[PDB]
């Protein structure tokens, strides 16, 4: 595994910079799109609206992320009810067969760009009920998953770390910069 740089070696490395695309763009047009691409990502990154799914006993720890101790809202994360206004879905709990068509539909109704987070073992791979006769073995069978948060339930910080991974994943989208090459 790639280990972190030592202090002395890191003592020379240049400051990272904010944009993951750097300021090394050859042309003006490319550079403007790169900077303009950051503006989109800065927007979507800032305000990520979950859907308030809350299926099973991960759902309780999905409340304590909104509790004052950790305060999801500090990061611009605001819970919402309608899937139209919701941007992210946190599938937290055991997605049984009876639910499975309902999650698919609710996910479909969510407008793009939509990212899915899988909370806990139940939604990751079927978890403790993996072999049950009425459990979908992981929600990735039904909807694409963008971040997997392990745990049972994941700690509140663990989910917070998951959300920040989604911000970083959002931060590095190349929606515009890849249109130029296309």
């Amino acid at each position: 595994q790639q280990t972190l740089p030592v202090a002395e070696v890191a003592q020379n490395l240049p400051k990272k910079g904010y944009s993951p695309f750097g300021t090394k763009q050859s042309s003006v047009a490319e550079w403007s799109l790169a900077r303009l691409d950051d503006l989109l990502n800065w927007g979507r990154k800032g305000s990520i609206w979950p859907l308030t799914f809350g299926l099973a006993c991960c759902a309780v720890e999905m409340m304590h992320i909104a509790a004052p101790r950790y305060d999801m809202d500090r990061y611009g994360v605001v819970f919402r009810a309608s899937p139209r206004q919701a941007d992210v879905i946190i599938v937290a709990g055991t997605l049984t067969n009876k639910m499975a068509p309902a999650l698919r539909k609710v996910y479909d109704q969510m407008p793009e760009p939509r990212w899915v987070i899988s909370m806990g073992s139940c939604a990751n791979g079927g978890g403790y009920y993996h072999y049950s006769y009425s459990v979908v073995r992981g929600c990735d069978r039904i909807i694409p998953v963008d971040i997997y948060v392990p745990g049972c339930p994941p700690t509140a910080e663990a989910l917070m770390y998951g959300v920040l991974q989604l911000q970083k994943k959002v931060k590095r989208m190349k929606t515009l910069q890849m249109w130029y090459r296309k």
Binding site: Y131, S132, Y133, R137, I142
Partner: protein, 209 residues
């Protein structure tokens, strides 16, 4: 003198023993057997037809007043000819006691619903039909309560595979979830948890023919 062993509650044992006999005289037609469990809990084994009568008797009689019906558990035992057993757990608030009524039924034979006596058994009976497949005659509207819509079979019978026969997946051709024959990445690994040496000698000769 020995702390680890649980201390039996003799006073509660004494009352249940005598009242256990009392039921046997009042309901000879139905009460097949009455036995006091090792947990100092009373069990009343009745014939299949005596469900509604016996339940009515325990709820309405002055001495019983088992007003509160707590559960209806179903047990599947393929060995027996009437493989399905149904157990009622009743509570008597006035007398502060619990009694169990058991009955046996086959795959097909219906079992008289007890919504009348205790209409708390509206859903419990629905569950039993769904999980095991025991039909309850005269029920208001029998219908699956737990399993998926159109789920075929009755999962909690011991003759039903643990993982079921069919999984679900999303098929982007059909734009909907579809059911396929089951296919597990890792099988359920059995473990043979069988002891070769008998440990409880008291039950070796129990239940003579």
């Amino acid at each position: 003198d020995k702390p680890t062993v649980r201390q039996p509650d003799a006073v509660a044992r004494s009352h249940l023993s005598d009242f256990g006999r009392y039921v046997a005289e009042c309901l000879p037609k139905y009460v097949q057997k009455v036995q006091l469990t090792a947990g100092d809990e009373l069990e009343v084994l009745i014939a299949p037809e005596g469900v509604v009568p016996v339940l009515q008797f325990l709820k309405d009689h002055h001495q019983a007043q088992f007003t509160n019906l707590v559960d209806i558990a179903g047990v599947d035992v393929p060995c027996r000819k009437n493989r399905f057993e149904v157990v009622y757990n009743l509570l008597s608030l006035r007398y502060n006691s619990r009694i169990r009524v058991k009955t046996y039924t086959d795959e097909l034979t219906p079992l008289d619903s007890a919504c009348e006596v205790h209409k708390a058994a509206n859903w419990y009976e629905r569950e039993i039909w769904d999980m095991y497949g025991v039909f309850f005659a005269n029920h208001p509207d029998l219908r699956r309560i737990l399993t998926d819509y159109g789920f075929e079979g009755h999962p909690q019978r011991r003759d039903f595979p643990l993982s079921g026969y069919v999984e679900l997946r999303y098929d982007d051709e059909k734009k909907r979830v579809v059911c396929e024959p089951l296919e597990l990445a890792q099988e359920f690994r059995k473990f043979d948890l069988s002891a070769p040496w008998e440990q409880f000698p008291n039950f070796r000769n129990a239940n003579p023919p």
